Design a protein around this ligand. Sequence first.
Ligand SMILES: N=C(N)NC(=O)c1nc(-c2cc3ccccc3o2)c(N2CCCCCC2)nc1N
Length: 245
Amino acid sequence: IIGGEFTTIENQPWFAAIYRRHRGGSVTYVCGGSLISPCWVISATHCFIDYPKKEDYIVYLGRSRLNSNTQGEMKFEVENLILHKDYSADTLAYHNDIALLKIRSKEGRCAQPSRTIQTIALPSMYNDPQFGTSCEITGFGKEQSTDYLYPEQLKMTVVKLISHRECQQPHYYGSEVTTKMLCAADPQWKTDSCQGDSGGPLVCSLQGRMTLTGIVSWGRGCALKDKPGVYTRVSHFLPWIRSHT
Ligand SMILES: N=C(N)NC(=O)c1nc(-c2cc3ccccc3o2)c(N2CCCCCC2)nc1N
């Protein structure tokens, strides 16, 4: 996250930290995600596509920091890693950038909701807030495009949903953005998602409720003018989500 603020897992208690075991047993951070039910985290396929073996992965819930433990956190193995059949990668844009991890502990349990661990609602079918609606994003992604390291502490910031029509302008993304995506940006382009934030939540208040409207997917650079964040539009994927859960 570029700009915004530090936070703690209590302000995004559905946020999932996803890591990978190297051969040799070093663990690096992969991507964010969101708990949508006690056994299921939703993320971006582009996160796992290079190393698609589920045994490689580790999921934490109730975690506020990248490389320190947080009192209350729960650690999970991936019992299932479901990548979207119709995924593709062009120059910039991921298509069908959506994945499902079914989490289970060594002692064979799903998430136990707590003050630091909660689910987030999916939206109703093809129902998203109006353009200019303010939503939140969360992750351990870079603070600056140039940064070598990820932050130790979770971040969140605020972006404004951009009209489909405005995102498709040639000097934004042209046709790279389809109806199964969303754009969001700062009016001043000064805060944004970045490398390390992929798979994480774009949360909007909808029928006055905290609702998972988006999954961080891509963008050109981070916090670049006429270069919004692009999000997987969860409200065009409920059949897929229901069908695979
Ligand atoms: N909201 C946005 N504008 N962008 C984003 O959401 C985003 N950006 C990048 C990005 C582009 C870039 C260029 C130079 C330095 C750092 C960079 O990071 C990003 N990566 C980082 C590379 C590893 C695989 C995942 C793709 N993911 C994003 N989801």
